[PDB]
Amino acid sequence: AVVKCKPTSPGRRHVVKVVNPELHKGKPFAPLLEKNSKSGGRNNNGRITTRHIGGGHKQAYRIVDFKRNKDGIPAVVERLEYDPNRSANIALVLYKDGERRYILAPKGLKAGDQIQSGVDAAIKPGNTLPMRNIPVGSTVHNVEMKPGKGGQLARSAGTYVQIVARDGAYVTLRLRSGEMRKVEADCRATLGEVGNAEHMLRVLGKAGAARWRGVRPTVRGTAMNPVDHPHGGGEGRNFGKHPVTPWGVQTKGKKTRSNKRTDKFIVRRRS
Amino acid sequence: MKRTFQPSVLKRNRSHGFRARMATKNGRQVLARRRAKGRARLTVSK
Amino acid sequence: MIREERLLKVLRAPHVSEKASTAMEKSNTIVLKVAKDATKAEIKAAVQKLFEVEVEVVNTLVVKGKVKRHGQRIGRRSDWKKAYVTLKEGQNL
RNA sequence: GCUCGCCGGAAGACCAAGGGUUCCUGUCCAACGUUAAUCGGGGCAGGGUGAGUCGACCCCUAAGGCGAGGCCGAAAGGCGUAGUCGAUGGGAAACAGGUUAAUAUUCCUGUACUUGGUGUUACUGCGAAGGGGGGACGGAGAAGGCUAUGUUGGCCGGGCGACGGUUGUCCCGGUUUAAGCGUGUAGGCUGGUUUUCCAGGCAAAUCCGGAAAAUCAAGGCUGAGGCGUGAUGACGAGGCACUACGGUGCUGAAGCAACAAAUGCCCUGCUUCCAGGAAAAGCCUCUAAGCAUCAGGUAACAUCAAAUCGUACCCCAAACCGACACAGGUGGUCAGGUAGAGAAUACCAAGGCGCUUGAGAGAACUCGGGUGAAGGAACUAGGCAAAAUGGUGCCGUAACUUCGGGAGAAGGCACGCUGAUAUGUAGGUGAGGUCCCUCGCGGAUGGAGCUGAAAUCAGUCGAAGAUACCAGCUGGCUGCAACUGUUUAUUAAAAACACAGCACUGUGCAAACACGAAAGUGGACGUAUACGGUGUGACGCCUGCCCGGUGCCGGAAGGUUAAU
RNA sequence: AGGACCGAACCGACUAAUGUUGAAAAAUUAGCGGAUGACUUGUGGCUGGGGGUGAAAGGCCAAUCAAACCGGGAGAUAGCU
Ligand SMILES: [Mg+2]
Ligand SMILES: [Mg+2]
Ligand SMILES: [Mg+2]
Ligand SMILES: [Mg+2]
Ligand SMILES: [Mg+2]
Ligand SMILES: [Mg+2]
Ligand SMILES: [Mg+2]
Ligand SMILES: [Mg+2]
Ligand SMILES: [Mg+2]
Ligand SMILES: [Mg+2]
Ligand SMILES: [Mg+2]
Ligand SMILES: [Mg+2]
Ligand SMILES: [Mg+2]
Ligand SMILES: [Mg+2]
Ligand SMILES: [Mg+2]
Ligand SMILES: [Mg+2]
Ligand SMILES: [Mg+2]
Ligand SMILES: [Mg+2]
Ligand SMILES: [Mg+2]
Ligand SMILES: [Mg+2]
Ligand SMILES: [Mg+2]
Ligand SMILES: [Mg+2]
Ligand SMILES: [Mg+2]
Ligand SMILES: [Mg+2]
Ligand SMILES: [Mg+2]
Ligand SMILES: [Mg+2]
Ligand SMILES: [Mg+2]
Ligand SMILES: [Mg+2]
Ligand SMILES: [Mg+2]
Ligand SMILES: [Mg+2]
Ligand SMILES: [Mg+2]
Ligand SMILES: [Mg+2]
Ligand SMILES: [Mg+2]
Ligand SMILES: [Mg+2]
Ligand SMILES: [Mg+2]
Ligand SMILES: [Mg+2]
Ligand SMILES: [Mg+2]
Ligand SMILES: [Mg+2]
Ligand SMILES: [Mg+2]
Ligand SMILES: [Mg+2]
Ligand SMILES: [Mg+2]
Ligand SMILES: [Mg+2]
Ligand SMILES: [Mg+2]
Ligand SMILES: [Mg+2]
Ligand SMILES: [Mg+2]
Ligand SMILES: [Mg+2]
Ligand SMILES: [Mg+2]
Ligand SMILES: [Mg+2]
Ligand SMILES: [Mg+2]
Ligand SMILES: [Mg+2]
Ligand SMILES: [Mg+2]
Ligand SMILES: [Mg+2]
Ligand SMILES: [Mg+2]
Ligand SMILES: [Mg+2]
């Protein structure tokens, strides 16, 4: 539920919270937890390689099952959980054999719902099948790009993919980007949309709220000296250049895709 | 006012001690030079 | 079992002081200068063999040598080890 | 030595870091010490640091480091797997009293505890490089229950007062005791037990997870404190006796209760929120290969062991970082009284100090302060500086507003002490007694005693009762930036930067992009509700015209045009 | 509840005076801002010089910064003093 905060202080006036009362209030399932310590956007040379990453809250990594390989064995949804590592919620599912796993929580999935994977699975949300066994027209998510590799497409809160055509070895997918893309029909997909579609409606409301998420400030190129950025310099606010990245590449329309290897599988670019 | 030298023996030995010098070829050259000069103390270790 | 050769090296001297004297009279404890690498086991073994007494317990400490000047020239005395050796009641040394 | 003054959330006490003998004693006063120095952190000599339990080492891991093979790279090297290191974190166990010139949870006294080795005896499925449990975790808030601790009373010892009074509802002091062991309470969590079965936990598993029965519903885990014991002990005001007059030796009363009470403990709890909150070992448990009436396990008892290194001293500082015995800097712990909301502030206690030149004098001028006739911003670039306001309760409070605010708007009234209400109230606490009682650290009742606001009425002193210290000046118009933040360490704190929000744009995942001859790594264990870049900068109303130039995107008839 | 309010510790540095061969190569005194957070602090770690890091001041990178420091090329060169 999307709830506007009352303006009892300047930092609250514009806050809009997304409050889901279904989410488990307790601690997560400890056998499926790992540490993921933070990078500060620094690589193994110790250099910043992505700017604007630092701090924020500590977060345990939940091992989420993107492969959905455990075919034939039904699973019941025990609870939905908050996952700090991603926009989607996750669902703790219990298999009949007593194995527990986390899956991306589809829209509509609730505690008590059954799910199953494999060719024989029913066409209902949460069920994972090879896309050759999914009816053309189906909305799916957590789609594999290579058979066996695990879901890579449509994992973010509220996302999904339509299977729009099948032709031999390949299905064609409409991605959220709008790209039409071919993928092997043996690639698995989970039925339905990723849940937590309200995710996008949150309004952080204050500087600090972005800092909690580990986002450090962006200094505009034009606020700098020439030595620091192509945009830097000027007495007063000047500009008088084509906008570029800090490394001098044009940043307003110039295309940067360069992958001849995967061009064959793009039917139509997002445009 | 806080001045630049804030001593820590652990940091001293890690940054400049004998074993740090021995760990790299450039560090070993430091030791070679200081032996050639005939320093009484090769490193901060002693 | 420590060898008799080793035992013959570990005790270096009795240590003479007011504190050592009070230790002997008050608490039946002899204070020795011992070899710097001597353990409590060796000091006990050595005192029992060489002085023919019964030792209750050994306490030890390392005394750090004093820095000194001998005509504007810095030197340093050696670290040495001191053993407070408590004898059993009745034993005399 | 007696007075005086200063600090007392420190200028006291204990540490870590850092230093390294500065510690104690004797001796010396050249140099050092901003003066003298008989003194010293100075010279010289001697002494002094005692551990199974404190800490390190050690076992365990974090960030990160190194890294057999490996992958990559003109060489040097880079990265990284298995590993192996790496605390600032996890992991066994000791307390009180006494003692030295100088150490003490280390010595001594008393009383404990931990882990491990051997052996003996009894009983017995043991076994890991593997599985599972546990260890194991956030912010905020709220209360209960406690204790540390304090206050008063009682008790004991002492006192009867340099000047009016002081045998009392009077004065001073003391009234302390640990770990451990026993007990299991306020509180917190959780249904329990047995049976059968099973696509999971790489194999196996009796363990964990799952399923289905049956039966029982109180069983377990956890837990401050209290009580008991420890303790017929220790300590103890003081007295008495020596003094080598600094101090030693001897003996020893009371040793209770009530009330208040933490920021400490119960509490790694509970409630709640979103930003969703280490790891690994010790520990517990399960089996595998293996071992078989053996090894090994469990228990009891005995015995042995628990090494090594640190331990002095300073430590908000004359001992560390600042060239100095330097108005500087430096993390943790301890937290008495009166007043007070308080760790503010004032005065004090314990304790510690008077800051290593003094003595006079009482000019100008400078510094730091106090007061000021009449006037009251006339000063000045500018009310700069100063003066002023300043508490609590109650009343009262405009435009405007995003409905929160604005607001402590503005402004007004009260305020001490005494008595009464009421020999101390409302409230809090709660003894005895009485009854019940799964008979206890229980329940009910009961109110003694203790503590104790706030108000009203009456009176009363002063110029003045928020009396000191402490402690908002207020209002009106307007530019800029929405806001809290950030910044030129050392002349700029701002209107600059950032910011939530907005938009454009790139990016289909071996993503774009970035670091990098490369391997790789970050982006991300993310996947278009995502990520990067750019500009704008809350919110409200909005965001027009121009695609020639220069970019970017797309096209392809023709011109021109490289290597070859 | 809160980048909420008043206010110590703690973090800072707006104004003034002093000081300027200082007590101090940036402080003191009186006032001042933040004070549950985009907070602050201890210990350890990582980023390296056309490089880092930068809520961006050309700021900071050991009292040094429009290219650190140390050594070397090196007795650079100096139509200048
Ligand atoms: Mg960014
Ligand atoms: Mg932005
Ligand atoms: Mg600028
Ligand atoms: Mg440029
Ligand atoms: Mg201009
Ligand atoms: Mg122009
Ligand atoms: Mg002993
Ligand atoms: Mg020792
Ligand atoms: Mg005083
Ligand atoms: Mg000396
Ligand atoms: Mg001394
Ligand atoms: Mg003289
Ligand atoms: Mg002199
Ligand atoms: Mg001396
Ligand atoms: Mg190699
Ligand atoms: Mg490596
Ligand atoms: Mg490692
Ligand atoms: Mg290790
Ligand atoms: Mg540690
Ligand atoms: Mg001492
Ligand atoms: Mg008490
Ligand atoms: Mg507090
Ligand atoms: Mg000490
Ligand atoms: Mg002085
Ligand atoms: Mg000083
Ligand atoms: Mg401090
Ligand atoms: Mg004070
Ligand atoms: Mg005068
Ligand atoms: Mg004057
Ligand atoms: Mg005045
Ligand atoms: Mg006047
Ligand atoms: Mg007047
Ligand atoms: Mg007037
Ligand atoms: Mg005027
Ligand atoms: Mg004038
Ligand atoms: Mg002023
Ligand atoms: Mg004033
Ligand atoms: Mg009254
Ligand atoms: Mg104007
Ligand atoms: Mg502003
Ligand atoms: Mg400045
Ligand atoms: Mg300034
Ligand atoms: Mg990738
Ligand atoms: Mg702007
Ligand atoms: Mg605030
Ligand atoms: Mg600053
Ligand atoms: Mg100040
Ligand atoms: Mg404020
Ligand atoms: Mg404040
Ligand atoms: Mg500039
Ligand atoms: Mg500098
Ligand atoms: Mg240059
Ligand atoms: Mg040359
Ligand atoms: Mg020259």
Domains present along chain A, CATH in parentheses: 1-113 (2.40.50.140), 117-194 (no CATH), 195-271 (4.10.950.10)
Give which of A156, A148, A152 is closest to A173, Cα–Cα. A152
Spacing of A9 CA from D475 C1' in Å: 26
Q: What are phi and psi of B19, to 5 degrees?
A: -75, -30
**Measured between alpha carbons, how far is C68 from C74 in angstroms, rounded to an integer?**
6
Contact C93, C52 (CB under 8 A): no
The answer to whether the Cα torsion of A205, A209, A213, A217 is positive or negative is positive
Q: Which residues in window 210-239 of A are less than 7 A from strand D by Cβ? A: 210, 212-213, 215, 217-223, 229, 231, 237, 239
- Burial class of residue A188 (count of CB atoms within 10 Å of its CB; 0-12, 13-18, 19+): buried
Which residues fall inside 5 Å of ion ligand 5, going by CB?
A: A 236
Give which of C6, C5, C54 is closest to C30, Cα–Cα. C54
Contact A80, A23 (CB under 8 A): yes
Spacing of A23 CA from D423 C1' in Å: 66
Domain with C45, as residue range(s), is: 2-93
Q: How many CA atoms lie within 13 A of C33 on its CB side?
A: 11
Count of beta carbons in the 10 Å neighbourhood of residue A234: 12
Residue C34 three-state SS: strand
For chain C, the straight-line distance linking the first and the last C-alpha, in angstroms and rounded, comes to 24
**Measured between alpha carbons, how far is A175 from A179 in angstroms, rounded to an integer?**
5
**Measured between alpha carbons, how far is A152 from A139 in angstroms, rounded to an integer?**
15
- Burial class of residue A210 (count of CB atoms within 10 Å of its CB; 0-12, 13-18, 19+): middle
How many angstroms separate the alpha carbon of residue B29 from the centre of ligand 16?
22
Contact A133, A189 (CB under 8 A): no
Report the run of H or E that residue C26 belongs to, with start and end: helix C18-27
Residue-wise DSSP of A166-182: EETTEEEEE-TTS-EEE
Contact A103, A155 (CB under 8 A): no
- Experimental structure resolution, Å: 2.4
CATH number at residue C26: 3.30.70.330
Contact A88, A50 (CB under 8 A): no
Total domains, chain C: 1
Q: What is the DSSP letter of C48?
A: H
Give which of A88, A91, A166, A92 is closest to A130, Cα–Cα. A166
**Measured between alpha carbons, how far is C53 from C90 in angstroms, rounded to an integer?**
10
**Measured between alpha carbons, how far is A208 from A203 in angstroms, rounded to an integer?**
12
**Measured between alpha carbons, how far is C45 from C42 in angstroms, rounded to an integer?**
5
For chain A, the straight-line distance linking the first and the last C-alpha, in angstroms and rounded, comes to 33
How many angstroms separate the alpha carbon of residue A223 from the centre of ligand 40?
17
Is the distance between the Cβ of C27 and the closest atom of strand D smaller than 7 Å?
A: yes
Is the distance between the Cβ of B39 and the closest atom of strand E smaller than 7 Å?
A: no
Q: Look up residue C84 and give its amino acid.
A: Y
**Measured between alpha carbons, how far is A206 from A211 in angstroms, rounded to an integer?**
9
Q: Look up residue A82 and give its amino acid.
A: Y
How many angstroms separate the alpha carbon of residue A222 from the centre of ligand 30?
54
List b or e across A143-158, with b for residues whose CB sees 16 or more CB atoms inside 10 angstroms.
bbbeeeeebebbbbbb
**Measured between alpha carbons, how far is A59 from A213 in angstroms, rounded to an integer?**
10
Residue B14 three-state SS: helix
Domains of chain B from N-terminus onward: 1-46 (1.10.287.3980)
